[PDB]
């Protein structure tokens, strides 16, 4: 009676019944900005990735928007790192600047700024360290200061990736109090402590990791906890919720989709990306086929948005 | 705390989180075929809709596929009508000849053929009429022959729209018995007796409708019964299932998609088509906007394939 | 074993098993009031629709109630439009007046008043515009002022159709503070930005649309968002929740029914209405069959109340 | 109030509430067998992965079981290839001889045998090719013989990876017909057409792939179809069901486990394996960490058995 | 078609498909401390159980941690009992002391302290008694005082087993106010009034029971109530929720697992433990087989943590 | 706001809302029958449990029914054991003779007979042993004969406890084939391989257990498999389904009752019985309290019928 192959006999039928499709509007492009003028830097562990100066960031975004890309995620590489990470909320920082410069040249691009104290502190953690402890409530306080500054600079969205407890609520409360109740918040709800963040550390020249971040980042073994985390975030006001990493966490994505009916974002981390790059370089796989497909999978798992370093290459492929 | 508008502030943002999009691969074009050579007649009640001769129809398909449209729904309009409606399964019928020519000229186009005795009988009914009674099992025996015949000519798919009991099963058996287990079946699982069918009858030269098809077509007040019908056909072997009509039956489509894990199809019926045509002709509505939008709504509801007379105008727009 | 047609063999059985029925109590009649005396105006894009003077509004309602209709929805057409739309909360406005006049003559009719700043502002939006921005929190403030005035005038219900964030809560808070905790609130929970609102603009002589309302009105592609919207509204205190438009959004209606167990309303917008009018005028469909049936569909989708310009014609048909 | 971090403050706490752990009893080791005596060849695209002769393979198994690994997946690589692929069911085939020797040397090791015509045919396909068509029912008839043959040699389990329609059923019948109702069946229920299979083909000396297996292998965009496929096989008699590939299809695995109450299996495909190999060789990722972690993710998703080329390196690590 | 035994034919397969496993990290070891130096006491009704002096408690924990055990549960046996049970929050009590001494010697062990006024009051109840009434809100007040002291002493977690209403919220509020918002709370959510607590009374030399505790402890007949209880606790801030007793309450454990997605703990009470001890002493059962298995059952029911007096013997068995 | 204790303040209140109660109609009494006349032997490992001769057994039943107990589970203990275990279906077997005498003396007592080859074979197994293999289909053929034989003697019910594949089906067919469609079937759907069975073996003079029954009895770590097993038997025709053992498998019982809408039965196994016996004999536990309570827990979990050796002591207590 049943012969599933009937729906595969031809590309037409296959084309007709396909449950999911990937589109440019599903892509968000991370951007690493640095101090200086007229300069871009190839990232060693991330072939194809780059550190941009602001003036070069603007140049890129201009190409981005023209290719279809709808938003990016700004990472700020400060010249100096401190223990109190106060540079985060300096309105004259590279990040704030880039925010300003970009919003002006390509105003129709959704700028999303990264919120975390890793690139600004000398211990490799996303929060303030005291006596070996990543201080929770104290870190949010800076995170708040930080976020408000991004808004002041013209940030469209903020994306706290800190995994500190109850930071989405505090941050949202601050944005409201400074007339920024319209700036969205994309929160890293289910960010796990993963061995996939390798190539990224070197990308922004972040201080030595110095002890895992497993005191706030999630245990990769855990699922139920992801539901606990997301829910708390939505209740706090998160406009969108994200899972990180992505490729090997598609079950966490599907689950968030089925339960919360809020937009769901996912991160194609440096490792999954750098991994396909290295295998292709040896001729063991197809860069194009593998990259795109793995994006399809993220779409089939329920993701709506996808932070991917392949974002620009995928937009040309869909052009 | 919450502010849904935050996801609407900007085209970018709006483009990123949009839950559904419409694509060319969602569209199936109804093609009306008539006897004769090199000719075309617009349908009075369906502006921009025409009947084609085989020659003209083959060329049209060429333009169809070129635009990306993946499939067509072949509708036959025999020269003579009979009470036993035997022409339906004639190897030289105008329909059959269309199947043969099309598959040859445009092999890559998935050809779905309509299966029903409506255009082949004088009573304007989808089945055989005895004494004011539209016979079920008798009618099905003529449908089988029809389906095989269509398969014998090169059909890729048949779409029984009769609403006879146990017709999907019988047909699936006949098709397999004649070495056509590769030929799928698209079942009008839930076809209601609607007043949304007006303009269509003239399209094919209908016949003394005589009474009404409410003894086999479903009452538009019922939803549960639609779940019974579909489950019955899926159990029978239907590869795909369709709801008819479409615009005003999106709740049935959402229910279908939500429960049966099989491809779901909807029908942008003639009455829906003409209605935009008319309103637009008065300047009360924007034809292109309402048409495309109404297609979107069908995607939002859970439809994978859309049988629409606007198929060609959408493929361009989607181009 | 199974033969679904057994339940369709006769009108008796069909009559017995029918899942849903439409009744007069499912209908609500919109009423467009204007300044002046003894005068009614045919609406160009809405054949059968009219602008009534108060004295003629009262005359109509008297006929309405006698035909069975249980409530109407008052729209107020001011003589002058301002940027601050302060006329909305003028207790001497046409709307308030009509409220008073009607409540007196036909006190047993549930008056529902429209809350929005579109007919009162010169930019064609339902809220206050500043620098191209439809101001959210500022608009509610007027909406509150407005609502309280409707209550003071004797309004039974208020129906904010503004789609501003968190207006149901604010409005409800105001009604309570002014001894109007008994006045209900029918909120347009899931109001989409649609191409179906065509003929309505001209109806009330509303200022040129001047840019879509997609910054607050919902993306027609979205469903999950509709659940997010409704829930927020119910939590805020909405007595009833409505979806708009209706005909092509029946999946949004069914979904709200199954999830929230609060009364569910729907809108038969000008487009769906004007659409059946134009098609019938060409003889392409049956005005009666199409109008009523599409109302049946709304009932089968789960709607309890139905704002329809056919309300009066449907009540005669059910008389 | 809430503070998820409270469960992360300490290794103890973290160890207590961890939802999932990975064990040696989750692992199944793919073994590639080739003709000849005392020899071994590493796979170019799969570092640390080798082909074995029967003698070398028996010894390897000894080391396997000693490490706790409970099962193996025997892969055959015949000397000569044919179009009817008859060698597949030859009692003296290199595969069969491996089954016989292994069960004798290490009886306590559960031997699962691969069932597909890929290594036995020149077209590099899993079924019989007629005229560019991969035959289903014909191919299945050769699979049955294959399965019985394997059972006749002492196989404990067969794992049809062909993706032919109704193959589990046919095989289960053949096996029972020859007194092998004790021989289970591990079905590749949902095997997609992925670009994650690159390195594997060379492992066995693949053949003119010619076209693509997207007429029987599933489209990576679909999830619903995966539920259809599995349910079909469980209904057929499959003792266990597998998803392929693995890392990027964890949503399919969670869905499977969540709905079918039968043992679920996943595949750490070659492309996934090599990808860590490559990245690690560059020093971008920690090979041991990513490998083990990715295995964990598969446990978190709902996988019970893992076919992984890292099986031996995990058993040690888990030791 | 189906033969479940296929998955049991061998230990390998059995080993592969096993749904659940018990691990050291699933075990928590209760510890009874008493005043004095260099001394341990065999518990009469709990063969293998002991009362430890602090210096001997430290000695045990040192062995515990080395065997794998990740946390213990401290019970404090005061020399004097009062009616106001003020000794509970004496920072110089045996309990506080033991807390201090243990944290120092084996700092990497998760200390969990018991919160209740039974060992500190002369009426055998877990709260303050007035006129035959176990005072609810007054008892929490002490419970708060108590908890804060445990935190001050260095307690990792507190485990209120009092079954007083709304004590998890109050206690959590106190810990926060005294800079202990990082100390977790394992609450006895569903603690029933059971005949299984026999041997435990004598263990800590608790005052005569003097009337059941059925005025706060749960009716063993009740299930729905357990859902009511847990939910209230989670909403109050409980990090983990526990059911007590365990062996004959596995349905209450499974239910809490499926509903709340918070970590779930269970208690192997003195009775279930002392029961297996007595039956084995007569040669009527296997101490080892019965003890371990019943722990497996608790794991299969959904428990994550298990307070068991066999904890040390089970850790050797898993070593 | 909330205070669950409000429902515990008083015996009245507690008695009113109690979710479950235990009744005499929940109890089924296992009866062990042996050859000979007028004699009785207490079981060493089951104090208060005895074996009866037919005469003594008939009288016991008289006392049973008088106390309200509605049913019994007849256990046979043949004089001689054989490898083909043919005595099982001997019309003059000690079991059969018991059936005949009982039904005559106490017709109103529902007689359920045990169906398994354990007491009838020397290998102490429930099926036929060939070469260290417990044969399934062969064993079932002997079970059928057994069941019919029992029905032929006047049995009201048979309770296959063998855990053979497809035995319920075969037996149900045999029973119907011999005009016994009125004879129900109580299936040990989910009987685990537990160490809770110690005392029972001696009760019947077990035999060289030789190995273990883990090739047909279920692994105590699994729950999903229990759902597979039950559904399989219900599909086969089992009137009722049982879980074994009981106390420590209440999660399986709740799951059963929750999903299958068929009567559910549990088994207070020997190891559970003796365990209270022993602890009570030491004065560590109150035997009457723990016994009755543990029965309650079984009612709370969803059990309708309880096979317990405490049946008679409960009927009195419940009297
Ligand atoms: Mg969080
Ligand atoms: Mg039907
Ligand atoms: Mg809203
Ligand atoms: Mg399949
Ligand atoms: Mg409580
Ligand atoms: Mg079974």
From Swiss-Prot, chains A, B, C, D, E, F:
Highest taxon above the source species: Bacteria
EC number, as in UniProt: 4.2.1.24
Matching SMART domains: ALAD
Residues annotated for Mg(2+) binding in this entry: 229
Entry keyword set: Heme biosynthesis, Lyase, Magnesium, Metal-binding, Porphyrin biosynthesis
Top enzyme category: lyase
Spans through the membrane: none
GO MF: porphobilinogen synthase activity; zinc ion binding
Regulation affecting activity: Stimulated by magnesium, inhibited by zinc.
Protein function: Catalyzes an early step in the biosynthesis of tetrapyrroles. Binds two molecules of 5-aminolevulinate per subunit, each at a distinct site, and catalyzes their condensation to form porphobilinogen.
Other comments on record: Does not seem to have a metal requirement for activity.
Protein name as it appears in the record: Delta-aminolevulinic acid dehydratase
Organism of origin: Chlorobaculum parvum (strain DSM 263 / NCIMB 8327) (Chlorobium vibrioforme subsp. thiosulfatophilum)
Gene name for this UniProt entry: hemB
């Amino acid at each position: 009676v049943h012969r599933p192959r009937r729906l595969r006999r031809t590309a037409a039928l296959r084309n007709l019944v396909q449950e999911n499709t990937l589109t440019v509007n599903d892509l968000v492009f991370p951007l690493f900005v640095m101090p200086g003028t007229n300069a871009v830097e190839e990232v060693s562990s991330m072939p194809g990735s780059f550190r941009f100066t602001i003036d070069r960031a603007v140049e890129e975004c201009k190409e981005l928007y023209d290719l279809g890309i709808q938003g990016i995620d700004l990472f700020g590489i400060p010249e100096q790192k401190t223990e109190d990470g106060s540079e985060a909320y300096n309105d004259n920082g590279i990040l704030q600047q880039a925010i300003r410069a970009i919003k002006k040249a390509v105003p129709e691009l959704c700028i999303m700024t990264d919120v975390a104290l890793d690139p600004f502190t000398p211990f490799g953690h996303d929060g303030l360290v005291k006596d070996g402890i990543i201080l929770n409530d104290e870190t949010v306080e800076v995170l708040q200061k930080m976020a408000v500054s991004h808004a002041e600079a013209g940030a469209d969205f903020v994306s706290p990736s800190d995994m500190m407890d109850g930071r989405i609520g505090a941050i949202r409360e601050a944005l409201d109090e400074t007339d920024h109740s319209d700036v969205g918040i994309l929160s890293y709800a289910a960010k796990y402590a993963s061995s996939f963040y390798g190539p990224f550390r070197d990308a922004l020249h972040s201080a030595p990791q110095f002890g895992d971040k497993s005191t706030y980042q999630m245990n990769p073994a855990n699922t139920e906890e992801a539901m606990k985390e997301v829910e708390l975030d939505i209740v706090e006001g998160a406009d969108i919720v994200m899972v990180k990493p992505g490729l090997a966490y598609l079950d966490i994505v599907w689950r968030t989709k089925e339960r919360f009916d809020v937009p769901v974002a996912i991160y194609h981390v440096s490792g999954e990306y750098a991994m396909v790059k290295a295998a292709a370089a040896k001729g063991w796989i197809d860069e194009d086929r593998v990259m795109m497909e793995s994006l399809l999978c993220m779409k089939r798992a329920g993701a709506d948005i996808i932070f991917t370093y392949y974002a620009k290459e995928a937009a040309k492929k869909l052009r």
